[PDB]
Design a protein around this motif. Structure first.
Motif, PDB file in Angstrom:
ATOM      1  N   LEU A 161     -40.908   0.959 -25.716  1.00 50.84           N
ATOM      2  CA  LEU A 161     -41.546   0.507 -24.490  1.00 50.84           C
ATOM      3  C   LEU A 161     -41.256   1.524 -23.404  1.00 50.84           C
ATOM      4  O   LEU A 161     -40.104   1.931 -23.225  1.00 50.84           O
ATOM      5  CB  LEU A 161     -41.017  -0.873 -24.070  1.00 50.84           C
ATOM      6  CG  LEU A 161     -41.323  -2.087 -24.934  1.00 50.84           C
ATOM      7  CD1 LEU A 161     -40.465  -2.099 -26.181  1.00 50.84           C
ATOM      8  CD2 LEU A 161     -41.077  -3.334 -24.112  1.00 50.84           C
ATOM      9  N   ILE A 162     -42.295   1.968 -22.697  1.00 49.36           N
ATOM     10  CA  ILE A 162     -42.122   2.882 -21.573  1.00 49.36           C
ATOM     11  C   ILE A 162     -42.969   2.379 -20.404  1.00 49.36           C
ATOM     12  O   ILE A 162     -44.193   2.253 -20.526  1.00 49.36           O
ATOM     13  CB  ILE A 162     -42.503   4.329 -21.920  1.00 49.36           C
ATOM     14  CG1 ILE A 162     -42.324   5.202 -20.679  1.00 49.36           C
ATOM     15  CG2 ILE A 162     -43.892   4.409 -22.522  1.00 49.36           C
ATOM     16  CD1 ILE A 162     -42.588   6.649 -20.905  1.00 49.36           C
ATOM     17  N   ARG A 163     -42.329   2.127 -19.278  1.00 46.92           N
ATOM     18  CA  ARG A 163     -43.008   1.695 -18.061  1.00 46.92           C
ATOM     19  C   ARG A 163     -42.905   2.818 -17.044  1.00 46.92           C
ATOM     20  O   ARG A 163     -41.809   3.320 -16.786  1.00 46.92           O
ATOM     21  CB  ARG A 163     -42.375   0.414 -17.515  1.00 46.92           C
ATOM     22  CG  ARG A 163     -42.821   0.006 -16.115  1.00 46.92           C
ATOM     23  CD  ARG A 163     -43.817  -1.081 -16.112  1.00 46.92           C
ATOM     24  NE  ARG A 163     -44.309  -1.327 -14.753  1.00 46.92           N
ATOM     25  CZ  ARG A 163     -44.053  -2.392 -14.010  1.00 46.92           C
ATOM     26  NH1 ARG A 163     -43.326  -3.409 -14.475  1.00 46.92           N
ATOM     27  NH2 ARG A 163     -44.568  -2.453 -12.786  1.00 46.92           N
ATOM     28  N   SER A 164     -44.042   3.224 -16.486  1.00 52.94           N
ATOM     29  CA  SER A 164     -44.079   4.262 -15.462  1.00 52.94           C
ATOM     30  C   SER A 164     -45.027   3.786 -14.372  1.00 52.94           C
ATOM     31  O   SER A 164     -46.244   3.794 -14.558  1.00 52.94           O
ATOM     32  CB  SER A 164     -44.552   5.616 -16.005  1.00 52.94           C
ATOM     33  OG  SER A 164     -43.766   6.068 -17.106  1.00 52.94           O
ATOM     34  N   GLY A 165     -44.477   3.336 -13.255  1.00 55.07           N
ATOM     35  CA  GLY A 165     -45.336   2.812 -12.212  1.00 55.07           C
ATOM     36  C   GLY A 165     -46.011   1.525 -12.647  1.00 55.07           C
ATOM     37  O   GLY A 165     -45.345   0.554 -12.996  1.00 55.07           O
ATOM     38  N   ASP A 166     -47.345   1.508 -12.628  1.00 62.53           N
ATOM     39  CA  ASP A 166     -48.092   0.303 -12.973  1.00 62.53           C
ATOM     40  C   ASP A 166     -48.243   0.093 -14.473  1.00 62.53           C
ATOM     41  O   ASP A 166     -48.697  -0.981 -14.897  1.00 62.53           O
ATOM     42  CB  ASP A 166     -49.510   0.362 -12.404  1.00 62.53           C
ATOM     43  CG  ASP A 166     -49.565   0.345 -10.885  1.00 62.53           C
ATOM     44  OD1 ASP A 166     -48.758  -0.379 -10.271  1.00 62.53           O
ATOM     45  OD2 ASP A 166     -50.426   1.073 -10.323  1.00 62.53           O
ATOM     46  N   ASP A 205     -46.425   6.724 -12.567  1.00 58.95           N
ATOM     47  CA  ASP A 205     -45.436   7.478 -11.815  1.00 58.95           C
ATOM     48  C   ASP A 205     -44.879   8.622 -12.649  1.00 58.95           C
ATOM     49  O   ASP A 205     -44.979   8.621 -13.876  1.00 58.95           O
ATOM     50  CB  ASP A 205     -44.307   6.556 -11.352  1.00 58.95           C
ATOM     51  CG  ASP A 205     -44.753   5.588 -10.263  1.00 58.95           C
ATOM     52  OD1 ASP A 205     -45.855   5.791  -9.706  1.00 58.95           O
ATOM     53  OD2 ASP A 205     -44.010   4.639  -9.969  1.00 58.95           O
ATOM     54  N   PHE A 206     -44.329   9.641 -11.959  1.00 59.33           N
ATOM     55  CA  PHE A 206     -43.778  10.804 -12.650  1.00 59.33           C
ATOM     56  C   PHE A 206     -42.274  10.613 -12.745  1.00 59.33           C
ATOM     57  O   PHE A 206     -41.572  10.662 -11.736  1.00 59.33           O
ATOM     58  CB  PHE A 206     -44.149  12.126 -11.972  1.00 59.33           C
ATOM     59  CG  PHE A 206     -43.898  13.301 -12.864  1.00 59.33           C
ATOM     60  CD1 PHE A 206     -42.631  13.856 -12.952  1.00 59.33           C
ATOM     61  CD2 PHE A 206     -44.893  13.783 -13.708  1.00 59.33           C
ATOM     62  CE1 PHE A 206     -42.379  14.893 -13.822  1.00 59.33           C
ATOM     63  CE2 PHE A 206     -44.646  14.806 -14.582  1.00 59.33           C
ATOM     64  CZ  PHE A 206     -43.376  15.373 -14.641  1.00 59.33           C
ATOM     65  N   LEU A 262     -34.648  11.671  -8.626  1.00 60.35           N
ATOM     66  CA  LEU A 262     -35.538  10.638  -8.110  1.00 60.35           C
ATOM     67  C   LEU A 262     -36.941  10.772  -8.704  1.00 60.35           C
ATOM     68  O   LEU A 262     -37.568  11.838  -8.602  1.00 60.35           O
ATOM     69  CB  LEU A 262     -35.644  10.761  -6.599  1.00 60.35           C
ATOM     70  CG  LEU A 262     -34.336  10.701  -5.820  1.00 60.35           C
ATOM     71  CD1 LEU A 262     -34.570  10.858  -4.336  1.00 60.35           C
ATOM     72  CD2 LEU A 262     -33.657   9.392  -6.086  1.00 60.35           C
ATOM     73  N   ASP A 263     -37.446   9.672  -9.254  1.00 60.10           N
ATOM     74  CA  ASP A 263     -38.783   9.662  -9.816  1.00 60.10           C
ATOM     75  C   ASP A 263     -39.780   9.748  -8.675  1.00 60.10           C
ATOM     76  O   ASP A 263     -39.501   9.311  -7.562  1.00 60.10           O
ATOM     77  CB  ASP A 263     -39.007   8.386 -10.614  1.00 60.10           C
ATOM     78  CG  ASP A 263     -38.108   8.302 -11.866  1.00 60.10           C
ATOM     79  OD1 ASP A 263     -37.808   9.344 -12.456  1.00 60.10           O
ATOM     80  OD2 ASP A 263     -37.715   7.182 -12.245  1.00 60.10           O
ATOM     81  N   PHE A 264     -40.961  10.275  -8.952  1.00 66.43           N
ATOM     82  CA  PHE A 264     -41.978  10.396  -7.911  1.00 66.43           C
ATOM     83  C   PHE A 264     -42.911   9.205  -8.097  1.00 66.43           C
ATOM     84  O   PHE A 264     -43.633   9.129  -9.100  1.00 66.43           O
ATOM     85  CB  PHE A 264     -42.746  11.713  -7.951  1.00 66.43           C
ATOM     86  CG  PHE A 264     -43.570  11.929  -6.707  1.00 66.43           C
ATOM     87  CD1 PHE A 264     -43.036  12.578  -5.627  1.00 66.43           C
ATOM     88  CD2 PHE A 264     -44.815  11.354  -6.570  1.00 66.43           C
ATOM     89  CE1 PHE A 264     -43.752  12.687  -4.433  1.00 66.43           C
ATOM     90  CE2 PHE A 264     -45.533  11.493  -5.374  1.00 66.43           C
ATOM     91  CZ  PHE A 264     -44.977  12.141  -4.317  1.00 66.43           C
ATOM     92  N   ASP A 265     -42.866   8.272  -7.150  1.00 70.18           N
ATOM     93  CA  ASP A 265     -43.446   6.950  -7.305  1.00 70.18           C
ATOM     94  C   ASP A 265     -44.415   6.632  -6.160  1.00 70.18           C
ATOM     95  O   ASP A 265     -44.731   7.475  -5.321  1.00 70.18           O
ATOM     96  CB  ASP A 265     -42.367   5.870  -7.387  1.00 70.18           C
ATOM     97  CG  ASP A 265     -41.373   5.920  -6.240  1.00 70.18           C
ATOM     98  OD1 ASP A 265     -41.632   6.580  -5.197  1.00 70.18           O
ATOM     99  OD2 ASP A 265     -40.304   5.281  -6.388  1.00 70.18           O
ATOM    100  N   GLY A 266     -44.953   5.414  -6.180  1.00 65.18           N
ATOM    101  CA  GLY A 266     -45.931   5.032  -5.165  1.00 65.18           C
ATOM    102  C   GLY A 266     -45.376   5.096  -3.751  1.00 65.18           C
ATOM    103  O   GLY A 266     -46.090   5.476  -2.826  1.00 65.18           O
ATOM    104  N   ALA A 267     -44.100   4.731  -3.561  1.00 64.94           N
ATOM    105  CA  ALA A 267     -43.504   4.805  -2.222  1.00 64.94           C
ATOM    106  C   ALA A 267     -43.477   6.243  -1.727  1.00 64.94           C
ATOM    107  O   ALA A 267     -43.756   6.521  -0.559  1.00 64.94           O
ATOM    108  CB  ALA A 267     -42.088   4.235  -2.224  1.00 64.94           C
TER     109      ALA A 267
END
Lengths: 80, 127, 68, 127, 127, 68, 80, 127
Positions: C38-43, B69-70, E68-73
């Motif tokens: 630690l960095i989580r971005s999406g999956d 994600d961005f 707002l982050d740009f995510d899967g939703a």
């Protein structure tokens, strides 16, 4: 799942472990793939291997041509 | 880990055999940017006659590949990129995806390496 | 130090009080008492040493012009 | 580990070949003081000339190297310095930075080592 | 809540009295898209003239308002837009921003509302 | 909405799985489902709504020069 | 204890609660003072009240004079 | 909550009755910056004849009052301050403490309000 933390390895059993804060944690039933390259560890949900992905794609028909991308998408906005 | 540039992912979706074989030789995690996902999703619907196969093949890719994600960390990297290289309207998407690779300490795989030469710190593989 | 530059495993998280954690086999483990980012971005969750690399810094600075 | 004094960090930021040669030969973590960060952030705006380079290069240095927060342990060490060596207005800021090195049991790297030889227990690297 | 489109956010940043009057009358959270953040970060360096004011004012806006982050939703909503309204290259970026409003069930605030009337389910505030 | 602008309590943290939490009496509580920002610096933990205040933003921008 | 997080109120018992990530959490035996002003909540270890602090100070002798501060402490560094 | 400027804390340590009464009227948490602690600690040892009373009185203050460490969030606020106001070597300490007040959404209490007029967003009480 859009968060950053700092932590420290600890010992759990006869194995190293790393705490995952709530904002970074995965579901408890999610199988994960863990891959290290050098000193960088990458962790994500196990959803199939790359070899399987490529084999699945090769068993499927493909489109008649490869799309010509458009990378130049951002408009010129007045005033920033 | 590797982040695939959008063009590489398009060639995977549309069945380019030279790319499909290259991808299995990468020795590490293979990551897809959500920004590439947006581009891939739009491309499904550009030509009606190809949409069925593009949809099904993209769906298998998105099931397997993990998506980045961005987020703020990527936007912070983008800020550092333009602080150094200056502003380029034409290369915003390029630099967004590269920013995600930087934030996740991943090598960026691209057919257009020359457009990324001005990004300090980026590990790049030219295909 | 590691035997190889590359290694991989699969596993699930476990509870550790009752916050979540992941076990790292020896070929994936970082040293003892290593500070981590630690960095989580999406999956994707990425973990690396917070100390960074002075070589990487100097190499990146070398890609940038220097003040007169 | 090593804590760089502010002028050493300025020279690293600026790409001084003498400092880059010495610092890349050091083994062990290289750490910055948040006090030095404050100094460098202000220095971006000290003059208009080359402010952009001061900014972009600072931000890359702050990304890679850890920046130590100034906390109660550091202030405890600062008290110990003033109690044992005497108060010095002109040395307050550099003693704050040295106090962080002491708290972290790190070697303090400085161009001005003679000014810090009055601090008991401090490990000094004179450049 | 409200999501500001990029040009509305530019005008807020710049202190446009028309926008500040309208936005301070809104009740409900006022949100920015990270896509707009990317645009504004680049805009700092678009010209040298008044880059400092663009930078300082941007950074205060990003501090106060959620980004707002740009995510899967959001990408799911983008797919739904292209599937239902058709692909449009020129509208990709603004549809990403609208997709975030949709995902957050927020009202999208824009100077260009006619360009978004093709999106099913989108709440629009036309300024 | 709160009855008063000011309120105070004392208490200890409790375990909630088995991560830590603090209970907030009604006169200290934020609304339901309110997004919060937490910042701890030394002895002090500060908590406030992440949405911020458009009035505070505009008032702060008004303290800064505007581009021509 | 130099960290930032985002969270969401939840319900625990007949009371609202807020999770404290490990990096922000206080010891489990630390009595805390919680003070709200507007929408800002400030939490710190209970170590005595201000009225008690001022009463303690007033029971003690004071120095012969009030120190003249020096605020201008930062040196002029060559080159930033 | 309130952050006391160093001068205010000095007057508390050294027994100024006008300040000691003002402090009990503040309706909120009273916070001390670690930077003020550094200044207070040094002042204990400036005059030997006063050091015993300054030490004991500062020790009671530091036991009761909660201390704000100087961390990345405060340094980010400092960066925003100089981005707007420009660089002032003379006011670095001032702006560091104000930056902590900003990060913790606290009102800054000071005898020198005029030196803080250039800090956007700061809530200030002049004593």
């Amino acid at each position: 799942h859009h968060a950053r933390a700092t932590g420290k390895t600890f010992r759990s059993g006869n194995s190293e472990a790393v705490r995952l804060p709530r904002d970074l944690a995965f579901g408890a039933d999610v199988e994960l793939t863990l891959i290290r390259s050098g000193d960088v560890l990458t962790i994500y949900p196990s959803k199939g291997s790359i070899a399987d992905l490529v084999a699945t794609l090769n068993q499927m028909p493909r489109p008649d041509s490869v799309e010509i991308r458009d990378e130049d998408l951002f408009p010129e906005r007045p005033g920033l | 880990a590797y982040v695939l540039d959008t063009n590489v992912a398009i060639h995977l979706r549309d069945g380019d055999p030279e790319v499909t074989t290259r991808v299995t030789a990468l020795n590490g995690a293979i990551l897809l940017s959500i920004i590439s996902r947006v581009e891939l999703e739009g491309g499904v619907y550009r030509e009606a006659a190809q949409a069925g196969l593009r949809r099904s093949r993209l769906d298998v890719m998105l099931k397997v590949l993990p998506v980045l994600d961005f987020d703020g960390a990527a936007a912070d990297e983008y800020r550092r990129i333009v602080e150094s290289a200056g502003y380029s309207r034409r290369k915003v998407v390029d630099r967004m995806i590269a920013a995600q690779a930087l934030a996740h300490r991943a090598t960026f795989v691209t057919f257009n390496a020359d457009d990324f030469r001005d990004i300090p710190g980026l590990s790049l593989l030219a295909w």
